[PDB]
Design goal:
With 234 residues, the chain is of the alpha+beta class. It has helices spanning 4-39, 43-50, 53-56, 89-97, 138-145, 178-181, 226-229; strands at residues 62-66, 71-74, 101-102, 106-107, 114-123, 128-137, 154-160, 165-167, 194-198, 201-209, 218-225. Bound molecules: arginine and sodium ion.
């Protein structure tokens, strides 16, 4: 029957769970770094803390955007001379969220590529002195969304609650609304399964929410080829 619906539900929960566990470990570093900088954030200690093998191999750039405009980042790169950390989208994201949150994908100014930033408000007893941040390329996340093994029948993407596709294997549909990519019979966020057409291919979409992301309701979208998926086992 439509036990394929049961398959898309389990794969959606497993993917959403694997993305949560993947982001939890990286959030652990930024919080551990923000709490250490809360105890000491002198340029001597901030330098030694920002350059360590665990942070360097995990994020493209690990940095502390201070409250007075001071910026320290590892590794260093070419940023505009008027670079103010407080005008950055990751600075206001951690401030408005009041906790460790994820930024929607934006253009990284140094390497010119889509990245998602983990950011925490660095405070010492409700007195914020800066915002700690770490950059994850959108390409890394896309690889983690599709780490599960499909039968070549579909893929998996990340979409927000409002319908804006965050990370996606197709670079075109990134940051575009769910209505833009699917103009007619736009899939609905949440349960259940929706039918749509993309590039002349009948597609079935399912959405499983990413549990555990404080401050965000992000859904793992699973878009599978309808005809290719109905090739079932015995
Ligand atoms: N010194 C650096 N290379 N910093 C790079 C990280 C900056 C951060 N991605 C931003 O958009 O503001
Ligand atoms: Na396909």
């Amino acid at each position: 029957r439509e036990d394929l619906e049961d398959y898309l539900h389990e794969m959606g929960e497993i993917t959403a769970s694997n993305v949560q566990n993947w982001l939890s470990g990286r959030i652990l570093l930024i919080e551990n770094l923000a709490q250490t900088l809360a105890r000491d954030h002198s340029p001597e200690t901030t330098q030694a803390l920002l350059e360590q093998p665990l942070l360097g191999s995990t994020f493209l750039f690990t940095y502390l955007g201070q409250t007075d405009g001071t910026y320290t980042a590892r590794p260093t790169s070419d940023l505009p001379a008027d670079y103010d950390p407080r005008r950055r989208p990751w600075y206001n994201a951690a401030t408005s969220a009041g906790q460790t949150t994820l930024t929607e994908p934006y253009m990284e100014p140094a390497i010119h590529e889509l990245v998602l930033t983990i950011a925490s408000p660095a405070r010492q007893g409700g007195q914020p002195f800066g915002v700690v941040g770490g950059d994850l390329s959108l390409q890394t996340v896309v690889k983690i969304i599709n780490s599960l093994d499909f039968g070549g029948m579909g893929y998996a993407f990340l979409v927000s609650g409002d319908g804006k596709i965050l990370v996606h294997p197709d670079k075109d549909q990134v940051m575009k609304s769910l209505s833009d990519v699917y103009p007619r019979n736009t899939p609905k966020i949440g349960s259940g399964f929706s039918e749509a057409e993309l590039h002349g291919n009948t597609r079935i979409l399912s959405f499983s929410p990413v549990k555990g992301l404080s401050g965000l309701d992000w859904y793992i979208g699973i878009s599978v080829d309808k005809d290719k998926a109905y090739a079932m086992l015995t």
